[PDB]
Write a protein that binds this ligand. Structure first.
Ligand SMILES: [Zn+2]
Ligand SMILES: [Zn+2]
Lengths: 51, 67, 121, 45, 20, 45, 45
C-alpha cells in the first residue's frame, strides 16, 4: 500500500469518479414557446404568399 | 403557542410566571429549583410551565399582512 | 408651476395641501392676475378639465400600463425585502450559469455584488 | 445521448443523388423555474 | 367664456392623496 | 368600492371590477380582501 | 442549429435546482416558507 504508485493510482481513480456534471445551467429571459409561435407565424405567412 | 393563563387541572394562574421562569433559568437555576422559587408546588402546575413550547416566537417572524 | 406676480418655480407634489382654497387666497390670485394682465379659465375649459379628471380617475388601466408603472416604481424603489430576495435569487442563477460556463471573470463580479448586497441581520 | 442520431435517407432519381438527412442531439441546458403570465411577461417562480 | 366661480374651481380640487 | 391588500408589500387600494387583479405599486399577482366593517362579537369561553 | 425547448420538468423542493436551496433563514421567512419544511416533494397544480 505504501508504494507511491499504488497511492497515486488510488488517488486518481478516487477523484476520477468524483467529477460528474453534464448539464449546464442557463438563464431564461423570455417565454420558451416564443420561438415556436413566431416560426409558426412566419411559416403561415410564407404559406399564404406561396399559395 | 403561548403560555396558558390557568393550569388545566386545578386552575391556578400560571400565565404571569413565564418571564420570571425564563429569567431564573438565565441566572443559572435548575428547572426544578426555578419552579420551586415561583411557588408551583403541585406537579399539575409544574407540568404546565415545564412542558410549554413557545410557538408564537416562530409565528412572529413572518412579516405582517396589514400595515 | 408659477405665481402670477412672482416667477416660475419647480415644486414637488407634497408641497400642495389637501385643504380647500379660501376666499382671500383666490381674491389675491385674481388681483395678481389683474396686475399681470391675465384672465381666468373659461367655464367651458373648467368643464373640460372636470371631465378629464373624472375620466382619468375612473379609467381602467391596461396590463402594459400597469407593468410600465411597476417598472417605473421599481426604478424608484430604493430597497424592498421581497425585491431584494428576488434579485439575490436571480443573481444566484446568473452565478451558477457563469460557473457552468467556466467564466472565471464574471463569477468574481457576481460574488462581489452578492457580498455587497448581502450580510443581513 | 442513448439514441443521439435520427437519420432520413432519400435515393432521389428525378442523375442518381443519394441524400442522407441526419440530426444530432447535443447538450442539455436547464434553468431555474420561471412563470409566464398572460400579458407575456416572465419572472422567477 | 364666462368667468369661473369658486364652486367651479372646487369641483376640480385634486388633493395630495389623489396626486399620490 | 371594495378595499384590497397586496400579498407582498401590504399596500391598500381599491378595484372597480374592471382593472386587472394586480398590485398598483409592486405588481404582485396576489391580493387579499380587507376585513369587513360589521360588528364582531365573541363569548370569551 | 441551437437550443430547442423540449419541455418542462417539475422540480423537487430543496434540491440543487430549487430556488429555496440558497435562501438563508431570513429570506426563507420573507418568502413565506417554513424553515422546518424539509422538501423532497413536487408542486403540481
Ligand atoms: Zn395545577
Ligand atoms: Zn404590492
Amino acid at each position: 500500500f505504501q508504494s507511491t504508485t499504488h497511492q497515486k493510482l488510488a488517488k486518481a481513480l478516487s477523484a476520477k469518479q468524483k467529477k460528474e456534471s453534464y448539464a449546464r445551467s442557463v438563464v431564461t429571459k423570455e417565454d420558451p414557446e416564443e420561438r415556436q409561435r413566431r416560426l409558426e407565424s412566419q411559416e403561415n405567412e410564407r404559406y399564404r404568399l406561396e399559395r | 403557542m403561548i403560555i396558558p393563563v390557568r393550569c388545566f387541572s386545578c386552575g391556578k394562574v400560571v400565565g404571569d410566571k413565564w418571564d420570571a421562569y425564563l429569567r431564573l433559568l438565565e441566572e443559572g437555576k435548575q428547572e426544578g429549583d426555578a419552579l420551586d422559587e415561583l411557588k408551583l408546588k403541585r406537579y399539575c402546575c409544574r407540568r404546565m410551565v415545564l412542558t410549554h413550547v413557545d410557538l408564537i416566537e416562530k409565528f412572529l417572524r413572518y412579516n405582517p399582512l396589514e400595515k | 408651476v408659477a405665481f402670477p406676480n412672482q416667477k416660475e418655480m419647480v415644486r414637488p407634489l407634497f408641497v400642495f395641501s389637501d385643504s380647500s382654497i379660501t376666499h382671500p387666497e383666490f381674491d389675491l390670485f385674481l388681483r395678481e392676475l389683474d396686475a399681470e394682465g391675465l384672465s381666468v379659465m373659461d367655464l367651458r375649459d373648467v368643464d373640460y378639465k372636470y371631465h378629464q379628471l373624472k375620466e382619468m380617475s375612473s379609467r381602467s388601466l391596461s396590463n402594459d400600463e400597469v407593468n410600465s408603472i411597476v417598472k417605473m416604481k421599481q426604478s424608484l424603489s430604493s430597497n424592498t425585502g421581497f425585491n431584494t430576495v428576488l434579485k439575490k435569487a436571480q443573481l444566484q442563477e446568473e452565478l451558477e450559469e457563469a460557473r457552468d460556463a467556466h467564466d472565471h471573470e464574471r463569477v468574481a463580479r457576481i460574488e462581489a455584488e452578492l457580498k455587497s448586497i448581502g450580510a443581513e441581520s | 445521448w442513448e439514441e443521439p442520431r435520427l437519420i432520413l435517407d432519400q435515393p432521389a432519381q428525378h442523375d442518381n443523388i443519394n441524400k442522407r438527412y441526419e440530426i444530432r442531439f447535443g447538450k442539455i441546458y436547464l434553468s431555474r423555474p420561471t412563470m409566464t403570465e398572460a400579458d407575456g411577461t416572465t419572472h422567477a417562480m | 367664456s364666462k368667468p369661473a366661480t369658486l364652486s367651479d374651481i372646487n369641483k376640480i380640487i385634486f388633493g395630495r392623496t389623489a396626486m399620490s | 368600492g371594495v378595499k384590497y391588500t397586496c400579498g407582498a408589500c401590504a399596500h391598500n387600494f381599491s378595484l372597480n371590477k374592471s382593472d386587472p387583479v394586480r398590485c398598483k405599486e409592486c405588481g404582485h399577482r396576489v391580493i387579499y380582501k380587507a376585513r369587513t366593517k360589521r360588528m364582531i362579537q365573541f363569548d370569551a369561553r | 442549429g441551437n437550443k430547442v425547448h423540449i419541455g418542462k420538468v417539475p422540480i423537487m423542493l430543496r434540491s440543487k435546482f430549487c430556488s429555496l436551496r440558497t435562501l438563508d433563514e431570513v429570506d426563507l421567512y420573507k418568502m413565506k416558507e417554513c424553515p422546518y419544511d424539509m422538501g423532497g416533494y413536487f408542486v403540481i397544480n
